[PDB]
């Protein structure tokens, strides 16, 4: 599994992205308040290189607050980035689940065929008899494979499909709201910004706070790149949420239409100069409950003439039904 | 050993990421305790770069206690973890010392067909005699492994892996138990925390504690990180044993029933066009003690198309008995 | 794709070469005011090395003034860069999705024939037979990609790779009027500089500023690396943006005409020794939708031999349509 | 040697494993006491930071007492670790000399099988004639090395294995009894601790302990690492020793018994579909001095089924005696 | 193109050791006066380790005279020192371009031939058809080249070249004069240098200068690493800049002649015994316009015997235009 | 040499391990001494941080006493070790130089047996005609090695192999007593040490001594790891001597027997079914005098059987005496 199950969809490897560069913002915040010096205090009497190594740690762990001329979220923001990145990274591992118990094999089948092409694709004298090659090896093992998981819970992929991907758009917007709920909706912040107003007069986002002791005026040096990230971080989480939507009702409208959902194979089945017997009809009532979907991600990923190929070759041994 | 039978069970993995993650963080501690400071102390009189480097270690051995505006529990929960990730690992080793007691060897057999199929999977002469091929090298391997195990105390080997199934449910069921008791059961602790109750007011995880020696205020660094992973392990342990108890509940279920145990079988059984001579009946009776449960393993594992081929060339040759 | 569809237009390669050039310089200034030390200070009276240590991140987020014998855009300059070499990322992801959906697939079949001719450009037995060999294996491998893509939105990918063109000159433009847009439009600064006013009296780009805090002239070395950088990144940005305009409207002026359009291929249809049946009007009545960008494209990046044979090969089978 | 005489018995790698964990605590208590610091004092008057560092030393090899509100074993346990790690080395090292005065070789005839196994595993053509592959090479290998080892000091190699197993029986709780007598019986300690009686009271175990120096107040850093060591160690050992009196008793009752002793080769001899000449009293009646020990030492270490193989094929071509 | 097109004319190598010889001499001034320290200074009177790490940055920041018993240029060498190199890389990117719009392709042809004789230079069968081989394979690749140059933009290649070559001597000889403006012509410091007035009295390039700050006495350690490199770097340039016009002068006269620049074919056409039926006015007729340059071109490059073999070897051929 | 010449024989292997232990303790504790600090000493008045880094050095090369509430051997303990080390090696070069000046080549002799036996043991076509594989090439070699050492000083080599026994055995017992010559004869220090009295009152072994200074109580750390390396070392190197002499007496009985020394050859020309005309006796006049030896030297390092092969072997062409 690990090395070949473990490991090309079309903006699905936006959750891949997502969770690498959640891990690395959170991961590197780690390191810089737990390697560097995140914070920095001026009691303005006298120090001795000990006091302000023990005033650091008690302004960081207690209240900080803020006054223009104890609010802060240090002590959540690096830890719900890696739960965000965890979260980002379940949809991957629940589509597998549901692939397994669905009863087919669809990575295998993928593998399969792609090594099949990639080794006789350059054999010259296996390059005339192409058809018969392809409707030779694979297919037999895409058929043999269509006919065990039709007799065990395999009749609906594509609904299994589809809820995976209305999960993985929930969690997008589930994540973009949880980031909104960890304090100014973006553009308001943007503006403010923008105008130029930084933080003097705004408020929020400080740099020089002070603190309690029993006049500290504490600087705030890794607060500098919080704000420097969210506004990045908002943009393209909600540009991610947008594609996962657009994805979604995309598969949701294939789903519910089943009618120019087989405009593919039946674009593919008018290329081949044989047209011999079998209608494109009873191909369609011995393949169309799941193989369509496999014809479909063979094509998605893949390619369009080794699927072609696959699928004008399929039409020649189905058989086993009609 | 160490090359093939020290190294793919459907959720059974999470053992080896339990140890992992336990592992990591036990070994993440002590070096943080070990190499970093773990605490630090202030004696509102003076320094000189020489007292704070003793009363750190004698604050840190010696007991603290806390008031709001000697509890700890630094010295046992870093290896108490490394006693629960030797505990997770436990089980593994119990499966495999008591398949080896049964007198059949599993792994070596998954792994000699699985050689076969990754070997002749390609070739394109050895794919159309592909049933001669499966009932020619490795099906008589299983049959010999069959007939030399039937002799030796494997007659219930299923009931072996029930076990096995059952003492890894009870195992992680414990491992949380004891996680409970080294404090507030969870909830709790998230609704003091999400209604904005840190631990000024709430009291339990202090950060900034006093120190009897003969007003110190040592700050403990290292606490911040305790209460940031007790919050994921508690979920992630609940999570692991409820669904290795789904697991055992599945076995059991398996073992206890024996009637549509056999759905696979009766399922693969129907797909080639031989139907020669041998009922579906004296196949199970030749095979129905120990026989199942390694097609089974070797459908769970090899996939389906080589469990099925195997499994219906085994019937081609099934004489031995009848 | 991570092998062979993420990895040599005639000066695109400049969009790589921007994102290079600006991540370096971006992550080089991070890591100098981040490692090093960016600024200096000294109150004239006395310090305790600790003093200096927190008055220098003070009077780097507070802001400076200057005056000769609180400007500054040390906030925005290191981060801006990254978002410039992000968006200089964008156009070319945006032309692989605009391949992507135009239904047809270049990179694979451009990667197909320069396998095919580095394989057999060697081969001396097959090098009479030269013709032959390309009218044999590659040239039907192109058709086949033609003709499923001539039946799924793909009769304008000259259309759509226009439009990538005129994406990336206008992002170039925008860039290069973003960084005017922090601060003197270029020649006017090299003027102020090479008649001999470098800061002292110009005033704009100080070195020496002085800080409030209730004359602590603080020295800001890591500006002495801006203005030897803005000063080659301008020139270099309209270099670019130049470069990437007459790119444009070459590829304008070629969509547009249509005429001198085929000049390449009617120059390489005039060299074998053949001209047995085909007319030239009948064959780009057969391929000009599409399959003239596609042989476009593979001299101009294959060649021009290896070009002109596949396209002279491709004559003498061409009979989907006429 | 070194390559392949010096490099797998159930539970017997318990001495290689007992060795490593061992070593490794040895190694690293030596290099924490030697690197790090592991002891710390405080003279509550005034340091020069010269002077501890001479206190430590002077404490540190000068004996400490306790007292709660001259003691030590740091100068035995990491060395009389590794004097053990070197004791549990032993006894492989006695039975590798044990059987070179036997006058037999095993390691070498193992060795041999098993590289004609893994060979001649996957060969098709020689599968068939799998019994004549191995009365044909290796089997003639076996009798040889029987025929030279019969008549050389070798009737009684089960007799010297037995003897290896009852030193590393007693090797093993001299080990644990050698833990014992360096300071409270285990469960003692573990009862004064879970009942919440950690040091404070309980005495032994100190971690602030005074210092003779003509109130020096002396804390033991690396004491902490000893009784979180120990707690397991005797555990562990515990373990390691019942586990090999198990093994002694089984191969004591082995010897004594030499009835059900031929179980497995009475079992195997009835498998194969020949049965043609030579009886079962007479085959052992050639082998039974000390080929039965080999044969289950093949069985023991290769499998099963290519031990059975052997072992049958060894009779079709006993014929040296009888 | 990185891997082959990126990747030997006599002394044009002398742009690429130009190119790495200053940015070495660049980098390495940067990082001396990033990481060392490039200046020191004293003030007489007393200082707390944090003066001088503050007067440092800002003397050197600062101008600073010198008198003997406002001045420097540290601000611009390292600096137009890559600025130099890059305008040294500049005149090979020229070329390939020129080359690119030319219409052949030259490289790759070279390339080709060179890939042809290194592979069938040893073979023994294929050495006494040698003649035979050459106008087989290879001959007929550059022919085609050549046909297809012809018609497109290619008829003028070496007025290209040349050209070329005038921007490199206008290159070198600018960079020089630019060396100059940046102060003294050479040989005056050397006679200032050699007579014994190394800088006490002669007063330019001091190392022990003043500083304003409201008798601070700085030394210029970095200094003595710049006339230690321009006394040399004078040399260098002039030299190269001497040998490109050299070259310059010698191209002129090849383009300008036509007559004495057929030596070389001329000469080469006299040792093989065939002289069968081309004349030599021909030949040329039908190669003269661009062959001429790359026959020469494959001589300077692969050498003068796998050049003649091939330049024989394409006159029994040369039948597509006369 | 240095590839095959420079690198079995049971237990002088003892010589090499004797070598690595004793310089890796000799490099240790130059690196120790040399690195880390060894000895640390205390004036009870003050100190500078300078004081005591030269009262180190002057106590240490000085001499030091100690009372209880000038002796030290720290100068030649960590070199008289290296000269051991290195007088362990010797007698291997001896031994090397002894089978060179007998003129024979042993070690040339038995890798190409090994070789031989290496390549062809595996070979099944080969293996049938077994003993005529080794009567074809390894046997004449060893005869004519044989051959050509009767006649140049090699008539004895046994007599120059139990030399260099004697002396190894001597060479041991000499490195024991000079051991004992470096201050307590073993048990006596044990029995001092095991009823416990470490150093406070048995006076020997201090490590808090005093140091004259013109009361300055210097503490010798690195002493605390010499006498945990005596104990174990006597230990070792008597065990060593013992083994050794055990040898020696082994040896010296057979060369004194000559009767019993050809038991092995006469057990081995007891195995093959031929017998066919050369009696026992005049192999042993052809063979008796140095191939004897060389037999021995077979068996004892290439195993037995391939030995037996060899020396069966040998009897079939053995007629170039008798």
Not at 160 to 176: D, E, H, P, R
């Amino acid at each position: 599994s690990r090395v070949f199950v473990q490991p090309d969809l079309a903006d699905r490897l936006n959750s891949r992205v997502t969770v690498v560069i959640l891990a690395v913002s959170s991961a590197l915040l780690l390191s810089s308040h737990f390697i560097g010096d995140p914070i920095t205090c001026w009691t303005p009497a006298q120090f001795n290189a000990q006091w302000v190594n023990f005033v650091n740690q008690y302004c960081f762990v207690h209240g900080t607050y803020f006054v223009p001329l104890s609010i802060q979220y240090y002590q959540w923001v690096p830890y719900v980035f890696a739960l965000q990145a965890f979260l980002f990274y379940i949809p991957r591992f629940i589509w597998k689940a549901m692939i397994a118990y669905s009863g087919y094999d669809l990575a295998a089948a993928v593998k399969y065929v792609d090594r099949f092409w990639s080794e006789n694709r350059d054999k010259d004298d296996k390059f005339k008899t192409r058809l018969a090659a392809f409707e030779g090896r694979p297919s037999v093992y895409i058929w043999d494979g269509i006919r065990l998981a039709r007799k065990k819970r395999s009749r609906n992929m594509a609904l299994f499909y589809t809820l995976s991907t209305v999960w993985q758009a929930v969690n997008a917007w589930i994540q973009f709201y949880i980031l909104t709920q960890l304090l100014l909706w973006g553009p308001s912040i943007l503006g403010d910004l923008l105008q130029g107003n930084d933080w003097q007069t705004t408020g929020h986002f400080p740099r020089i706070v002070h603190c309690d002791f029993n006049t500290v005026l504490c600087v705030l040096t890794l607060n500098i790149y919080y704000e420097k990230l969210f506004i990045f971080l908002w943009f393209w989480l909600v540009f991610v949420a947008v594609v996962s939507t657009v994805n979604c009702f995309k598969w949701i409208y294939y789903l519910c239409n089943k009618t120019k959902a087989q405009k593919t194979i039946k674009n593919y089945l008018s290329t081949a100069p044989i047209k011999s017997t079998i209608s494109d009809d009873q191909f369609f009532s011995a393949l169309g409950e799941d193989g369509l979907f496999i014809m479909d991600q063979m094509a998605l990923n893949l390619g369009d003439i080794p699927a072609s190929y696959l699928t004008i070759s399929m039409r020649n041994i189905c058989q086993d039904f009609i």
